[PDB]
Point group: C3
């Protein structure tokens, strides 16, 4: 190899997408966690998730209908509540007593739908709830532009390695990482970055390329990352938020999603034109990661240099989600920090940048 497959899917919150796309006003089928899931909303507009296959004789609940607070199976119309309780068998003398299917705990946060997953079958620790993003509810920000792809032939765990790599900021995103720090603690892993645009990549000048980016990116649990993007072109500031999230479909396939909201420029003219530019731009930055992730294997026992930083400590952090809560080791979870020195690399890269535009 590199790498024996996980035997479970990770314990945590997984984002299924934009909440308003699961509300129309039918059930939705999602394949996830090696099964099929049914997603549907209440008569109160509250979102529920169940095993997708009817416990009676196997009808696909996602092919059925919402009737009041229950999804009705397409086959014989039995009625399943968001808590999994069989509420009614319409034509029967006696609805089964205290029957239920598996229900999944759900959370709507920042206009996004999350489901909880735990192999051990325990409910969500309140301590690991996904944070609200205030700007998702601001009329001063755009609303989620959201994308999703299916990646086959790898495990979702392959993509989290990005948290820890300073050097790809140059080769993949075409900037110069001038500051690089990782923090792991509890259920959160973070990356803090200062990045400068490269002069040799067509937005130079001189005196007219020169974006500076300050980035904080955090994983809140195993699968969901918020990235706060503050960049500048001199004195022109722009603010954005990129969501990088995934959920496993299989141990060899997963859905990768990304969303972007931007602080609307005031403005102007509508000003939608310029927000599309800001959005498509963060989107293209994400898509440069996808190109790599799409054509790469995971390396279980990597050849590492000092500049790799905290690769092992990050993999140790991520293990916590795959062990029973009772088996979590201090060192998975205790505060770890590392600043990666980017000064030699930056002098090498500036030399290569210089070398390139001397032509």
């Amino acid at each position: 190899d590199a790498g024996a497959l996980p035997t479970r899917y990770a314990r945590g919150w997984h984002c299924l997408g934009v909440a308003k796309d699961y509300l129309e006003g039918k059930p939705h089928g999602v394949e996830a966690f090696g099964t099929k899931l049914v997603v549907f909303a209440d008569s109160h507009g509250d979102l529920k998730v169940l095993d997708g296959y009817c416990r009676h004789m196997g009808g696909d609940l996602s092919e059925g209908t919402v009737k009041g607070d229950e999804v009705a199976c397409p086959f014989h119309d039995w009625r399943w509540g968001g808590d999994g309780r069989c509420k009614l068998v319409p034509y029967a003398r006696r609805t089964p007593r205290m029957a239920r299917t598996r229900s999944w705990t759900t959370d709507v946060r920042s206009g996004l739908l999350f489901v909880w997953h735990d192999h051990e079958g325990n409910p969500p620790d309140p301590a690991v709830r996904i944070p609200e993003i205030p700007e998702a509810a601001s009329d001063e920000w755009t609303d989620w532009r959201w994308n999703r792809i299916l990646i086959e032939g790898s495990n979702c765990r392959d993509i989290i390695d990005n948290v820890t790599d300073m050097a790809h900021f140059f080769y993949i995103h075409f900037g110069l990482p001038t500051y690089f720090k990782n923090v792991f603690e509890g259920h959160i892993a973070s990356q803090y970055l200062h990045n400068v645009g490269r002069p040799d990549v067509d937005d130079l000048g001189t005196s007219y390329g020169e974006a500076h980016l300050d980035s904080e990116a955090s994983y809140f649990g195993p699968s969901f990352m918020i990235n706060w993007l503050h960049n500048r072109y001199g004195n022109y500031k722009s603010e954005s938020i990129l969501i990088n999230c995934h959920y496993p479909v299989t141990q060899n396939s997963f859905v990768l999603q990304w969303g972007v909201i931007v602080e609307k420029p005031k403005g102007m003219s509508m000003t939608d034109k310029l927000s599309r530019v800001f959005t498509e731009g963060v989107s293209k930055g994400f898509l440069q990661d996808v190109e790599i992730w799409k054509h790469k294997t995971r390396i279980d026992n990597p050849l590492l240099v000092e500049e790799d930083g905290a690769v092992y400590q990050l993999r140790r952090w991520y293990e916590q989600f795959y062990v029973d809560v009772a088996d979590i080791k201090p060192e998975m979870v205790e505060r770890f920090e590392i600043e990666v020195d980017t000064k030699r690399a930056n002098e090498f890269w500036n030399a290569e940048v210089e070398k390139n535009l001397k032509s």
Copy 2:
């Protein structure tokens, strides 16, 4: 789960389709029973089935030719009789002596081709021969309109559960089952039905919907069902026969077939126009089952109500085909009958029908 896969394919007769489609005058390839099969007719027009792969060096006999009473392998022209005997190697000094491949016992019944399958390798019990349908040879009836699909991702055993379910007649076929009885005995499982058209499903009236259907449906062995359809619209009677049959390709894929013949209306004008309407109509009734079967799992340990009827007894009946003939249990095979009470359901359903057209 629901359900550990069978380790054998069922012992019995399996229909391969309309006999006249296997007669033209070449061999035919069929994948079935986890292998490849070759089908071909005699110089007497008698139909034979063999393992499809030549015992010499593996040529695909279905890619070859019929020469007299033998199929000639495309590779080196060896000649295989319908009983599996190597009859000739044309260029050789000495044809192998008492060499053979596996041959499959065949039956042409009602213009349909059947092959026999038994894991134990024993020949067909005469007691289980598939019955003749006289109307398949009547010029007073239409001839087989026949359809076939490949279902991937399930086992063929999933579809036989339909024999025992009264309630889908309402939700799936949009009628009201007014009488419902099952009989299992020997190698045959039967369903007897009286069904009334629903007023809320656009053929009402009042006084102008109102079909009454009397249905007898029997499985003759594991895979082949004849359904006798007698319905009325007042005094206008119509007669039809639906064949529901399948054969396994793999333990996770099978071919589902259906054929319909109708009693031709006298007539009239040709009268082909009206026979097409009668045929397409039974066909669409079958296709409503297919929609369910296409998007459903089998439930091995189902949540059952009283109205489910004889679900366990039917699964016990079907087991007989998967055990060695010597291991068949009395209770698989002894006469079992159940009438399912449809009176409460029918009052519930009439209320819902009433509720619907009050709008």
Copy 3:
């Protein structure tokens, strides 16, 4: 069955195609031997092969670039020499010391690229080097017209059985084998053939069909065959060379390739017109084998007649490549010859040829 899958890929030289197609001047991805391979040339134009996945964090080297004598990984630009040595990590203070990936020994012979494979991980025995074909470097011959297909659902070992079969020359290639001899010795298996065109296959005459073909075909190791084709139409001689070669992708899939060069006719008129006819013609002869190979299984325990010749001795020869060099048995490798008597078959076939054109 027929046949338990090999547990290794064969020890020997495998042809990857025309060397000039791997030189342009980027790396190439090839799937082979159950992995992914990267192919690239030097700054000296010398061709190298490595494991395709970067040992750092798994980037696909075939998606990267050639920089001097090394392929640069697309992910972080590490630099890998044709011998597998990590030569530089560009941005790092310290390149890893004495780090390497797996490199594959390479050979350019007759304008074709070969890679060496050995489960035991030993280098190429000089004794088994693939011979030069002088005519591949002659301006009196055409240059490689080359074709490649992917065969899924079989093992590459299935096709080598052709070496030993006289009778397919009639049924598959439509000629009459008048002389047939096999020689196995060491790492080489050979077929010597005299073939006459069939009168009943539209190039008769009389006095105007009547090609005579003298053929020598040799496997040099497990996967690569040169076939020298000398045929005549009376006094008009033509010379060609067909390469039949393959490499395994998986134990159930492989790439089959074929190339043809012809002695250019002098000439004439350009004379390219006639060389295309000669080439397309050998190509179509090869393609008649492919039709069989595409629709056939391997038979592990075949029903054989005397006319089958040395089927077992050929399979025993081929075993050598699948055992450890230390475990090769005398009888795999010692000189074996057999002439197959084609006289009775030829009288049978002439009778059938006669029978056919009497119509």
